[PDB]
Every structure is written in structure tokens, then in C-alpha cells.
Symmetry: C2
Subunit: 320 residues, 2 copies
């Protein structure tokens, strides 16, 4: 009755999404900018079938838990509403993420699902509409629909909240050296909802355009130092909000702190690199790709760093 397969990459936010204006629609409180990660992929096949009563979900070869299925089912309901078709679908998804490494899959997964599910049900959405749809699966998924360096235009409405590519992957050879911590959280959905308990979240949110403008310009101009200092600042602002929520969300591990301090010292001593952390203790170390081997060496030397994943700028979600 209709089938398609799409791949999408996770992304690393240079300017973080944290907090929703609308939790249901995943309209964020602030805009965000990320880079897709080429070497990590979710591949998702959607198969719409005649009179399948309910949707099904398999994840990396295994029956998905009911939470995951429900979430994917509600998402497909949106694809059904948008398409006025009623078919239920079998969803098969796999990713190549290193096991236990704590790399969040939701952005890649809902980007791939948005593209596979709409293509399977016969639609031909623009990138913008795919981003808007993916967004409602998981906010950051909207940024994995476009390619390369991506900005989520936060908006106030479902139509207005979507992501676009600032620059293609080939515009700037940046590498994300992801320090995976051996010892290793509260999910994004709960965390976003808790942001409003932090006294500092409104101020963080209100300041986001300043930060976005710097990062956007830095990407366009390939100004690594400006990017570096702002991504650390923006990471720290998000974590500041997290840590001052009620209950506090302390995603950092002790080694996360060692890495953050080490990266700053490395940069200040001549090695261009910068850190950023999502809702977890892994440290993404962004650097011009020519420095990645040196960064990885230094990260690998830090006690407590299990392994370092090397990712370059990835393309948009694609059908295969």
C-alpha cells in the first residue's frame, strides 16, 4: 500500500534547544543551530498496509517497547491527518550508533520517520514541511531534516517553527569529537518541561538571538574562535538552567567537567576546539577537522574517557 526508506543523521546543537513554548507541537522557546553528524545514521522503513489495525515498530531488529510505539503511532497519526489516508504502518528502524554510548537517536529517528512515512504514504513534502513534521516527533528532529549546518527558526506557530540549512556540510570542515564517558539520564521531554522551574530560563531564552546571531555569522564566515566561545557559553547556559531547575538536572559527570576545562585550556594553548554538551555527560568537542586527530588524542588521554567518536558534517535526511 506504500513503502519508503529514509536515513537521517543526529545533530549536535551549537545553540541549544531547551524549553518549549508549546510542548504538544514542540514549538521551542528559542531557536537553535546544529550540525548533522555524517557517520551516525538512523534508517527507517515505513510500510503502510491495507487493513493493519494498529501500527507496529521494530527498533534495531527488536520489538519496540510500548512507549516508543505509541510515540511513533501518534507521529504517524499526524502523517495520516496531513494525508487524509487511514492506513496503519509497520515501521522498521535501525541505527549504527555505538552501543551504550548515549548518543541520542530521537532527532535522527523522527527526521528519518518524517521522510519515510510521508514518502511511503505518497506525499512529496518540501524540506521545510518535512522539518515541521519531524519537529512534532522530537523538536531537534526538525534540524536533522536539512543538511549540514542547520538553524531551527523557532516561531510561534506550527507553520513558523522549522529548520533550514545555514550552510551545507562542505562549507566548513568541522569535526565533532564525541568523548563517550565509560560511566554514564532524565529524558529531554521531562527536562524541557522542567526548564520553566529555573529562575534563569527566561533570561537564557531572551538572550538566545544574541547567541544565534554570533553562531550563524561564525558558520557563514568560518570563524572558529567566535563559534568556539559561543558554543561553550551556550552549552553552559543550557546546563545552568538544567542545574537550577527543580528538581535540578545535573547531566554532567565529573569527567565531563575535566573535559570541558581541558578543551578550553587546549584552545587557549593553540589547539582550536570547543566543547558542547547535550542532555547527558558526553562531551562533543567541535574542531576544524585538521585538528581532529590531535583533539581525539588529547581526549583519549583523559582518564575516564571510554572512547572518542569522530563525526564530520552530515547531509540532509534522504530517501534510499
Amino acid at each position: 500500500m506504500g513503502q519508503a526508506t529514509a536515513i537521517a543523521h543526529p545533530n549536535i546543537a551549537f545553540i541549544k534547544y531547551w524549553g518549549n513554548r508549546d510542548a504538544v507541537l514542540r514549538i521551542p522557546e528559542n531557536g537553535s543551530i546544529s550540525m548533522n553528524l555524517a557517520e551516525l545514521t538512523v534508517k527507517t522503513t515505513v510500510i503502510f498496509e491495507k487493513h493493519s489495525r494498529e501500527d507496529t515498530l521494530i527498533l534495531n531488529g527488536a520489538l519496540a517497547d510500548e512507549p516508543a510505539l505509541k510515540r511513533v503511532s501518534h507521529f504517524l497519526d499526524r502523517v495520516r491527518e496531513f494525508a487524509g489516508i487511514s492506513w496503519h504502518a509497520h515501521v522498521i528502524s535501525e541505527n549504527n550508533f555505538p552501543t551504550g554510548a548515549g548518543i541520542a537517536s530521537s532527532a535522527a529517528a523522527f527526521a528519518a520517520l518524517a521522510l519515510a512515512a510521508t514518502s511511503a504514504i505518497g506525499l512529496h513534502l518540501s524540506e521545510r514541511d518535512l522539518s515541521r513534521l519531524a519537529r512534532k516527533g522530537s523538536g531537534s528532529a526538525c534540524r536533522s531534516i536539512p543538511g549540514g549546518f542547520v538553524e531551527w527558526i523557532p516561531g510561534e506557530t506550527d507553520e513558523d517553527s522549522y529548520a533550514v540549512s545555514i550552510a551545507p556540510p562542505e562549507h566548513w570542515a568541522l569535526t565533532d569529537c564525541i568523548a563517550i564517558l565509560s560511566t554514564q539520564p532524565i529524558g529531554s521531554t521531562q527536562g524541557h518541561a522542567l526548564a520553566s522551574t529555573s529562575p534563569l530560563q527566561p533570561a537564557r531564552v531572551a538572550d538566545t538571538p544574541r547567541r544565534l546571531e554570533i553562531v550563524r555569522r561564525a558558520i557563514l564566515e568560518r570563524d572558529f574562535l567566535s563559534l568556539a566561545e559561543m558554543i561553550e557559553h551556550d552549552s553552559n547556559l543550557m546546563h545552568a538552567v538544567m542545574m537550577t531547575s527543580t528538581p535540578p538536572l545535573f547531566y554532567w559527570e565529573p569527567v565531563s567537567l575535566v573535559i570541558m576545562k581541558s578543551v578550553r585550556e587546549w584552545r587557549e594553548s593553540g589547539l582550536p576546539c570547543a566543547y558542547t554538551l547535550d542532555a547527558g555527560p558526553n562531551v562533543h568537542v567541535i574542531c576544524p577537522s585538521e585538528y581532529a586527530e590531535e583533539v581525539i588524542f588529547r581526549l583519549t588521554s583523559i582518564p575516564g574517557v571510554q572512547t572518542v567518536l569522530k563525526a564530520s558534517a552530515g547531509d540532509s535526511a534522504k530517501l534510499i
Copy 2:
């Protein structure tokens, strides 16, 4: 020998933090703060005004102070000289019992003791308010070591308006500060000035009355859980601002974070305690005193904790001998 006096004062641990100045020179803070004096740590300072001294001299634990420390003390004594209308320079002899290398800041205790010894030596009989106001200009938090016990710094907007008062005497509430000294340090002065670079500082500052009102009530009501949750929140707010300054100030060490998480776990599992951190990695673990031995036992076992200092609520700065 134109007048001499000796005073003692204790350092203090802020439950609601001072961070950022409205007026850096006068150490008028952006926000109010609340602290508890630490009985078991003391600075004892003798001030002897000398007709023959051309400049002040500062002796610390029997040794000549570094030049920066002398300059701070001499600038402070200039304020006393001005206030008193007297010219004399002084010998300042100070001792303290702080554990060596522990990173326990002495400046609040030092300037509280100096404010009291110096004014007493020079013939003045200042009210606590005026002593606090004076101590504040040596080091802001010293204004909180002038009064006793649990102390609130009224932030104010003027030199006359910024001073601390006792919320409650030490005996009002048996709380212990179990200070986890880490085995493995940008100064406050630079740090406060950088607070203005954090996008989050205005919001932290504007929220302080909410936090002060909770802690003040918690102290008056002996409500440990309310105190506990607010001191951790307040500590994290300050460190949030520090970590989001430009350049960032990351005072936490990895072990700091271990302790912070451990403390929250301990409290949630039924051991009443709460963490707070100043501008450094040591973790002050506040708890009702009946739990201190267990808190200390748990803290002592944490790798990277060099030692744990046990402090109870201390009295006001006092003249002695």
C-alpha cells in the same frame, strides 16, 4: 603605642550567596545574602597604633604579610583613620587556626576582626551596624562575620545601607557545616566583577529576595528541608552565573560534583544534609548537628576528599584581652 585592641572573628558559610557588586569599590553587593558563622575557625587580630610608624605593618601567623595583603589592610586602615580623624599607622598582628592549604577563605573573618580591633584600638565604640558597614569595605562577606550566628547582609544601595545583622544567635539552631576539603582558584574580587558578563546574573539577582525570604524563614522556623533545598538551589544559581561568565569561572572540581550528587542522594534517602559551594571546589555540607557525625563519615569516605572540617554556628566578632 597610641591604642591597641585585639578582636576575634569567624569565617562564615553563605546559605544565600553574595555574588556581584552594585559598587565594587564600596563592596555594595547586587543582592543580599545570609550566612552562618563557623565557630571552630577564628582569626585573631591585634591592632597597635604607633606614633612612630610611617606605614602600617601586617604580620600573619608570625610572618610579614605579602605586599598585596598589606596593601589591602592599609587601605582598610585608611578608612578607619578617616572615620576616626586620626593619622596613626598601625602594627597589625593576626593569627588564625585555619587548616593550611585547605582553601578556606579567611578574608571575612580577617576583615571582621580587623574592623573591630582597629576601631577599638583607635578609640571608637562602633555599633554592630557600623562595624559591619566598615568590615564590608574590607571584604564584602566580612560584614557578615561581625554579627553572630545566622546573619543576613542587607544589600542596600549606599555605603550606609549595606550591612549585616544577626537573624538568629548560634544557639537558635544546631546546624553543622561539614566542610569537605578537596585534596586538589580565581579570586572573588575578579569573579564578582565578571558576574556582569553572565546573561543570567540579572535574573539571579532579581530573584534573590525570594530565596532570602525562604532561608530567613527557614532559619527562624528551623525548617531544615526548606533550608536544604534553597541552599543547594542558591549555590547552583551562583555557580550558574560563574560558569556563564566571560571568561567562565568553573570553580567546581570533579570531586565537587561527586559530593554534590552524593549529598542530594543522602538527603533523599533520609540523611538530612545539603550542599553549598563558595568560589572554590570545597563542599560545605550543612546538616542538623545530630546528623553531622554520619555526614562526616560519608564525606570522609569519598575519594578526593582530603579531610572534613566540622564547624558549628559561631558567635559575633568579639573584642578580647
